[PDB]
Amino acid sequence: MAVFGAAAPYLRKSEKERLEAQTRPFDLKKDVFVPDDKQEFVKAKIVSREGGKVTAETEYGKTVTVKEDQVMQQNPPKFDKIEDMAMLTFLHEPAVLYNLKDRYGSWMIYTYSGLFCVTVNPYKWLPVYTPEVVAAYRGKKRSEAPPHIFSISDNAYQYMLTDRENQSILITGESGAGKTVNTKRVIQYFAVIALEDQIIQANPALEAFGNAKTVRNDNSSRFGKFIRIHFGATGKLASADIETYLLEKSRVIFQLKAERDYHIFYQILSNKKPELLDMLLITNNPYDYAFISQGETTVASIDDAEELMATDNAFDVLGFTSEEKNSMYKLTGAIMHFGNMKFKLKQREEQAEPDGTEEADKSAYLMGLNSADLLKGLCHPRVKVGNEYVTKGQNVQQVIYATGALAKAVYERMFNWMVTRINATLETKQPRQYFIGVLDIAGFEIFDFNSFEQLCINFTNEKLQQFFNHHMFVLEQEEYKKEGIEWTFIDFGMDLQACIDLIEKPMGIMSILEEECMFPKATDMTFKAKLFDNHLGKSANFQKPRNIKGKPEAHFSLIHYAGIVDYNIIGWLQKNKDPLNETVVGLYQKSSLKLLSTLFANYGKGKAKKGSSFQTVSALHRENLNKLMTNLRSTHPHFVRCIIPNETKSPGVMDNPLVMHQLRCNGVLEGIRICRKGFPNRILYGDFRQRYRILNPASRKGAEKLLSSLDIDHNQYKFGHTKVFFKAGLLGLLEEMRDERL
């Protein structure tokens, strides 16, 4: 226990202290888990089971009665503080909550939970991050060493080196709960076992261009960052790669009532650089610009001026010139100038014509196009019919949708190209063999006014959770085919895929939405009517909404792995349209700027060319999710779960509702639930004997004699050849008969 340097206590408590804590009275009958009001479940004692009446005496002095249908045992003391939640004798929801609660009070951060690695961030410095434990872990195994991310990092490394394949680290948590520094210590450990400074140096750029204020967080990430750490043949550090996925475009145009756009517009709106404002014609007033003013104007998030400076510094120290930063800033200002355009219908026709031309002129002067030419390209697109061009007509709604789609497109284009430039700066010529990627993605966010974007996020997280579930299924089949005990041949993925089929499949929600924004006079009520007519009752997970405590509104409710979510319809048709304007895209290709590179080229024998008008954010998102799954499904994955203990920066004290929220939205509970259908308590025969032989004191014959003389049913235990498998009730009964034996 000295091999763990000075961090040994925090990493794992001594066996002596373990045994000194084992001695503690606990009544298995009347100290069971009990539902609560202020929290979900609190530690209490019951006086008696008086019919339908019980009385819970908690620590707070309360004596509430709870119904006999909502009570469940508490974890025994001889199995509290367990490192692996999967090995718990009784797998309940608040059971694991209190397990991690006592583990963080006792200041043990990392905890194994089967195929996961859960990490609640400590708020003060610990010796657990000293290089001594890093170097001294080399040579110890996963099955025995106490939980820590260095363990799974080394396991991924050696898995890569033995199987000659890539691995994937899926760090899962909220921005501002320690994800950045967790990945930082990951990359440090990887460098140790053999460019992190460059990663952190270029990070403020992505933090600017892909983070925006939501309600649950003021520095939430919207894009799916994912760093590929390549290696060589000798498993030595070769180079690092990075890719961006699923960057939400709707933010650039529409913002909710309680949230802001991306940080960059506000950082530019910081007057600390007056040269940017007077070169971009940006008036100081943020209410002036319509694309942004609909969201939260300003919040006490960060020092935005200083962040502007930090980003400019990171830019100047990155490979690209000052002119290029200048073009980036001016392009963002042009996107900002798009919103104030004004169009009117014509005299006695249905055609759109511009009345205000000043912002048009200035946006053209910025973009490097002609103002009259851009106005003509917006009001009168030209389309190709065989071997001739004919002009298409537009009204105000159509030209506005086109403007919004153009802005979203140019922003996303500049973003992807900026990431390419970042990767080019990082690029080293060393040969790059198999990599181990680390993935940063949005969370299964729930609110009271969920919308289209939250539906997209939850759909992504559904694909991820189903992927992990199938992964763990194959892992359990591997355990079984090793143990020579093979049963229960049903997979664990379809039970979740049934919910996916309600989003992606034809006549699913996304297909109905696409059809509805294609139909002539569709409205939100018609969208709702079609959803109901085509799914209500005929499906399994789609169902009515619920109105609780006077919530704002809900039009329908889906059920996911992370609970029942009620979604709102209003605005989906208008926000899903993505009609890109081909004539203006050609204008961009013919610009006098860097813009011509971003829009280099974008829109017989079998052509899947969907039109410019038949474009939907949902469809582009489904395609991107498909290709992200195709990139992940080729690598053996690993999962990291990050939980905030409390919203306050004060350590020690926690918030049980926030813990439950993280557990549900993260899927640790779903993992333990997939376990709860088999035999989760899995122990060998030797320690089984050494702990339960005094019941019938005297390896299959003696074990079987004891089992038959312990009144255990056949289906309750599964007889293995190295370990014999038992369930929660079996562990409880064996515990009780040991206790009476003593």
Binding site: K384, G386, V390, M507, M518, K605, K607, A608, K610, G611
Partner: protein
Amino acid sequence: TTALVCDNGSGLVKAGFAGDDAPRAVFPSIVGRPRHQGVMVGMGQKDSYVGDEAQSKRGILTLKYPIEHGIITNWDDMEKIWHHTFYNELRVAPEEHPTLLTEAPLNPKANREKMTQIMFETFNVPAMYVAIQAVLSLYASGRTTGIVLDSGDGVTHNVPIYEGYALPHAIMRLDLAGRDLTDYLMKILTERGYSFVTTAEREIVRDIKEKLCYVALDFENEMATAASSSSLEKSYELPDGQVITIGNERFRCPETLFQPSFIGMESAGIHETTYNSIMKCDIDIRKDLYANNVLSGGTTMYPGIADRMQKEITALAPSTMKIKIIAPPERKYSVWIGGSILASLSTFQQMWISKQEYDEAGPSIVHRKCF
């Protein structure tokens, strides 16, 4: 899998893929056969040119239209047209693509029956469907009500639709269209000295019409203006020189649409059949129909036709209504655009006629609820 939207029309084939913004292949529906003998031995002449090639070899061919007024009259020529469309213009294999075809209202039933028989047996498409041109125009126009006037090249028709329900007893069909306008323009040019008689000169006359004709707002005043001034005359350049100058023939040709007595028909103009269809419709929807009068098809493409028809329908209707005529610039392709929209709709995917249904019920399956 993706669907094919082939709006075969009558005088122009328009094909493409469902989900596009415009047809990919647009060429005349013409089959030409050589009429001279052919002396150069070894060059290997073929026996029939179809499509846009027949317009290049136009000088030595006899051009046939396989489809007369909506109705197909030459099934072998039409199979050649379709084969050319599938293989030599789109380059797709119809064994793996559903095909949406378009037809005018009030045609014979054997037309649709033979059309689907061919599509399932000769070309072996997996599914197919026959739609009405006016409904697809109204899809592409972004309406759900409105009286649509679809003037193609063989047939003109009105189809009043309200709230997605069509009023079949009010559908009017007229057999005056661009082909009759071309014949009238030939016959009316002959009085200035020019004579075009061959089927290869019919195409030159059609080009003259497209390029120089327009609709007068007031016919008598434009006739007096042409009789007095000379500011109306344009010149055209034949494919061998010898410019021709036409005067009041420019607005006298498309005026046949509003006075079909010019070509000896008895019926009423398009402005009057539109109003009569409206007056057949129920009294509660006539205001919406007056406000949503949609034009589509190549013959609605003359300059001034929208203003003329608004003047006429306004003089006809009661003086307290808002007459409004919707004439997009991409009128000519409205049927194809609407067809693409429809075939891409996800609700539509259980309204195809499958190969199994056909092998089960014969070609009669076309007129069933799978219309």
